[PDB]
């Protein structure tokens, strides 16, 4: 049990405070460093585990020992001494560049920083499969863990007298969060008259009871067993976008269709939600073209009318009708059109802001309703 | 011809449906796989072509054979058996990490996956130049296609018994899109009194008749022959941004000048369009200094008043008057100022939304129009 | 929660729903990067290059060593009551 003294320090953040005290539990004592220094001198192999009765095993890795044993030592009786030094000097200077890029000025805070095992690959000899084998890191979810960069290390001791770095590497454990479901959404376009429109919704959505929130898939791998994320991926969703996903459909934003857009039909419940005003829906059973009047924005294709349908040169057998016949413009409320471009947002936001300032005097007049 | 039976499938997208059926045409029958397996067993070189009359040639590439024939096999009369295995083991484990990073869990949908020839470079042995020549891929536009990642491969067959992956690689054919013009825009700053401003316009703009659209140069190479693009780069432009490009200068958003902005003079029609209120425009042929009065926002320099002009430290020889004398502030309409920062947009959008809610009881109760 | 009926009327459809799992760190193991190799079998053939290698390492290693010490000296045992 230790306290943070709190007086020799300046403005410090929760990450640096927690990591600073966590360094006390993970850092080896002065005796272990002396024992580690003595055992590292006698080490000859690129990867070697040092067994100590006091605590757990420590794995020692050397990033240029493989070149020396496999290439240089067998050539000692063949090459000259001048050439041997030249070849090793090339490998040492390339090694230093990777150490400089890893533990360098780009690493602003060496204490609060977590380095993934894959980012350590060159510092470890080039590969990490032999390192993970000797660390005991294996299982049915190693690939999913490794794909999310879940194996991370922290610097615990740097020895400038013997030139070695000690890190604390941990194999994560997977815990399921109750009440949270991660939904992946897909969409198709629809036509209002002759314009093809598209609904803007998040690609991933997470729900927890009555709460709908966004989801970040940067650190998440969607393995068949389940979704595994390194960092907690839930961040809040705007209340207006939450009413869209609850069925209002007037709070959802529509965007126009770009040049590269191959999402015009989706197979769902043995049916075909297809935009027949933007592609050609042909009924292979009868040869009749499935049309779509301007009063309809979407059509659902089932075997009750067209058992086999051809869309965009693709023939698909459909089944029982699980959907209505079509969606009508007069019986659906659609949202306002938007543009997702960075410059398009700025142009429209600036135009809207200017309009508000031109009527500032009218807006502040709250007594106009009272007067009338 | 085949039909997709939409019965054993869940929700499937058009890309998954189209790629699934396209796999039937691309995949080889069980006899060709049996013949391919026998030929691969007798292959000895890093790259070989398999000849058969049932189809076209199949190129066989193995990613480690170059090391074995060039490095390992020659050095076996002097190296021990144990050292030979260690040297090969290092290469086999780095090759695996390339295949894991390529065909592993990071590849969520192998059916609809198109892999560029560049991404396969290490899996092909390190270099793709010798692979491209044996595929017959050459011509004057190889560099433009190759730089746009136009050569892509699809996964066709995976054999776990003999450990090989069959891919379908295609050389694209370029077709010019009728009626589409891609414009590259440049701009200079202008001064309103003492403040230097700048017009926010897209760097690339597409034109098709009366319609103006945006352009995405991410996959596009502007080769001397022409513009070659992998995907379709046209996406819709906001109607307000289209009125700006069509003449309405009040619809163009303007932003303040950064600290690294050094675009203050442009050479156009043999003249110099310069912001002389922000740089020192000096007439070399006379020694006088060209000034920009605050009633003018931009200056056009021609040889009719100053044949040679020094701009910052560079002297250029301008030509006959191809532009007006200057642009006057009272004879031009400018748009609203904006900020393109993500935090600047959020702060200004929240302020605008909050003011809108403060007048909801008045904006919705728009009945004084008919009451007055 | 999500009203899937109205989402399908505007083209939006669900294509997958699973449970959410995060990562937690419980145990820790020690990994040591031995920066200085063993050159006993080389017989002084790399004397000059090793010294060059050591000098470059100190320039980048020394700031990290100072940062670690400055924080671990600010950690003191509990002296309650």
């Amino acid at each position: 049990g230790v306290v943070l003294a709190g007086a020799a320090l300046g403005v410090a953040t929760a990450a640096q405070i927690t990591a600073g005290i966590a360094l006390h539990q993970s850092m080896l004592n002065s005796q272990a460093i002396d024992n580690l220094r003595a055992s590292l001198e006698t080490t000859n192999q690129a990867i070697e585990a040092i067994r100590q009765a006091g605590q757990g095993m420590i794995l020692a890795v050397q990033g240029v020992q493989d070149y020396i044993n496999n290439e240089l030592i067998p050539s000692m009786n063949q090459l000259s001494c001048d050439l041997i030094g030249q070849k090793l000097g090339l490998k040492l200077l390339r090694y230093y560049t990777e150490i400089l890029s890893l533990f360098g000025p780009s690493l602003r805070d060496p204490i609060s920083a977590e380095i993934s095992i894959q980012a350590l690959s060159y510092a470890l000899g080039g590969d990490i499969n032999k390192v993970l084998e000797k660390l005991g890191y294996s299982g049915g979810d190693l690939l999913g863990i490794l794909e999310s960069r879940g194996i991370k290390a922290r610097i615990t001791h740097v020895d400038t007298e013997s030139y070695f770095i000690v890190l604390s590497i941990a194999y994560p454990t997977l815990s399921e969060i109750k009440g949270v479901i991660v939904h992946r959404l897909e969409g198709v376009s629809y036509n209002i008259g002759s314009q093809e429109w598209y609904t803007t919704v998040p690609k991933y959505v997470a729900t927890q009871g009555y709460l709908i929130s966004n989801f970040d898939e940067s650190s998440c791998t969607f393995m068949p067993e389940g979704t595994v994320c390194s960092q907690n991926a839930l961040y809040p969703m705007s209340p207006l976008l939450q009413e869209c996903l609850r069925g209002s459909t007037k709070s959802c934003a529509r965007t126009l269709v770009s040049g590269s857009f191959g999402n015009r039909f989706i197979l769902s419940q043995g049916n075909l939600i297809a935009n027949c005003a933007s592609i050609l829906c042909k009924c292979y059973t009868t040869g009749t073209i499935i049309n779509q009047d301007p009063d309809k924005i979407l059509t659902y294709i089932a075997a009750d009318h067209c058992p086999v349908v051809e869309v965009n040169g693709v023939t698909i057998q459909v089944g029982s009708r699980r959907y209505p016949d079509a969606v009508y413009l007069h019986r659906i409320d659609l949202g306002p059109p938007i543009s997702l471009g960075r410059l398009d947002v700025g142009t429209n936001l600036g135009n809207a802001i200017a309009k508000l300032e031109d009527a500032k005097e009218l807006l502040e007049s709250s007594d106009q309703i009272l007067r009338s | 011809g085949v039909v997709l039976a939409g019965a054993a499938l869940g929700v499937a997208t058009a890309a998954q449906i189209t790629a699934g059926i396209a796999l039937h045409q691309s995949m080889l029958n069980s006899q060709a796989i049996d013949n391919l397996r026998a030929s691969l067993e007798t292959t000895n070189q890093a790259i070989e072509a398999i000849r058969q009359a049932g189809q076209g040639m199949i190129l066989a590439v193995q990613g480690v054979q170059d090391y074995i024939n060039n490095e390992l096999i020659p050095s076996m009369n002097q190296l021990s058996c144990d050292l030979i295995g260690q040297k090969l083991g290092l290469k086999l484990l780095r090759y695996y990490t390339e295949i894991l990073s390529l065909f592993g869990p990071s590849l969520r949908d192998p059916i609809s996956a198109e892999i560029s020839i560049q991404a396969l470079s290490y899996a092909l042995g390190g270099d793709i130049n010798k692979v491209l020549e044996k595929l017959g891929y050459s011509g004057g536009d190889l560099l433009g296609i190759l730089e746009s990642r136009g050569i892509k491969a699809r996964i066709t067959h995976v054999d776990t018994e003999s450990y090989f992956i069959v891919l379908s690689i295609a050389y694209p054919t370029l077709s010019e899109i009728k009626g589409v013009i891609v414009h590259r825009l440049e701009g200079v700053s202008y001064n309103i009194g003492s403040q230097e401003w700048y017009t926010t316009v897209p760097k690339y703009v597409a034109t098709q008749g009366y319609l103006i659209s945006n352009f995405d140069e991410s996959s596009c190479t502007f080769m001397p022959e022409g513009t070659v693009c992998s995907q379709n780069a046209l996406y819709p432009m906001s109607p307000l941004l289209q009125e700006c490009l069509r003449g309405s200068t009040k619809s163009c958003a303007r932003t303040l000048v950064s600290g690294s902005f050094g675009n203050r003079f442009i050479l156009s029609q043999g003249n110099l369009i310069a912001n002389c209120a922000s740089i020192l425009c000096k007439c070399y042929t006379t020694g006088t200094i060209i000034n920009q009065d605050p009633d003018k926002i931009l200056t056009y320099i021609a040889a009719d008043h100053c044949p040679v002009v020094e701009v910052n430290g560079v002297t250029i020889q301008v030509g006959s008057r191809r532009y007006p004398d200057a642009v006057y502030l009272h004879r031009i309409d400018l748009g609203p100022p904006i900020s393109l920062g993500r935090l600047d947009v959020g702060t200004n959008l929240g302020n605008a939304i909050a003011k809108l809610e403060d007048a909801k009881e008045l904006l919705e109760s728009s009945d004084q129009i008919l009451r007055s | 929660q999500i009203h899937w009926g109205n989402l399908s009327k505007i083209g939006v459809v669900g294509i997958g729903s699973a449970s959410y799992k995060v990562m937690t760190r419980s145990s820790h193991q020690s990994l040591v990067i031995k920066l200085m190799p063993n050159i006993t079998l080389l017989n002084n053939c790399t004397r000059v290059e090793i010294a060059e290698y050591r000098r470059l390492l100190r320039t980048v290693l020394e700031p990290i060593r100072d940062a670690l010490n400055a924080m671990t000296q600010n950690i003191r045992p509990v002296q309650s009551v």
Partner: antibody, heavy 119, light 107 residues
Framework: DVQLQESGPGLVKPSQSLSLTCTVS?????????WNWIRQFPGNKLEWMGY???????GYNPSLKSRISITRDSSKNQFFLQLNSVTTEDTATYYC??????????????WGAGTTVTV | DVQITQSPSYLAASPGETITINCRAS??????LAWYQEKPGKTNELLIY???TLQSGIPSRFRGSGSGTDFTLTISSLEPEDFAMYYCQQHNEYTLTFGGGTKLELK
């Protein structure tokens, strides 16, 4: 083709918990459709219990929703039925079926073999 | 909920004859009603859905009709395999209520 097969205890003590398991073959239950539970009383009476959708949406019979719960297992491709406070009236033949997930098209197109529960 | 009554409870007929089963709902359910066939030793089969739509693979002799509250199922040219239990189930709303049932006996 889609094959549904129930497997559970034939006899359960009163006021205990009932646990069934409908295993689905020839499809995946994490891909589309509503997976339902229907029970047939002695006397030719069918009664809908509830459903789990592939979007993990659940619904139950209003007169039985208090003591019922439906859950799914993606790894083994099966879904379960949990019934508590079992009385003598709960004895029936229990059926697992597949519907679509959207009204008014909630008709069942694949049924399980069927299993009987005695109280 | 909606109450559905299926009549007759038992029906005796002979092969080659035409029969008719009527189902009545307390409240209008549009055209949304499904018909099923129950046979011992085999799983149930959907015959008609959404009023009068014949499921693929079902013999054409099965006829559905009606809209709102009155619904009828017609089987013509009876075969020995058509003698089984039949149900009518409405799929419009919750709660999903089946029918009483109807059995066919040879005569």
């Amino acid at each position: 083709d889609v094959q549904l097969q129930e497997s559970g205890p034939g006899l359960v003590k009163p006021s205990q918990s009932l646990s069934l398991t409908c295993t689905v073959s020839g499809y995946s239950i994490t891909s589309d459709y509503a997976w339902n539970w229907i029970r047939q009383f002695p006397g030719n009476k069918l009664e809908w219990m509830g459903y789990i959708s592939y979007t993990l949406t659940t619904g139950y019979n209003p007169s039985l929703k208090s003591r019922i719960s439906i859950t799914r297992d993606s790894s083994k491709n099966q879904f379960f039925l949990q019934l508590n406070s079992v009385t003598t009236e709960d004895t029936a033949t229990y059926y697992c079926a597949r519907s679509g997930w959207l009204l008014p098209y909630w008709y069942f197109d694949v049924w399980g073999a069927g299993t009987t529960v005695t109280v | 909920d909606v109450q559905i009554t299926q009549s007759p409870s038992y029906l005796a007929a002979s092969p080659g004859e035409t029969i008719t089963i009527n189902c009545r709902a307390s409240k209008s359910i549009s055209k949304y009603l499904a018909w099923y066939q129950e046979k011992p030793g085999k799983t149930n089969e959907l015959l008609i859905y959404s009023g009068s739509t014949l499921q693929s693979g079902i013999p054409s002799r099965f006829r559905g009709s009606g809209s709102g509250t009155d619904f009828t199922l017609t089987i013509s040219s009876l075969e020995p395999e058509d003698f089984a239990m039949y149900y009518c189930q409405q799929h419009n709303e919750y709660t999903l209520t089946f029918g009483g049932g109807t059995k066919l006996e040879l005569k």
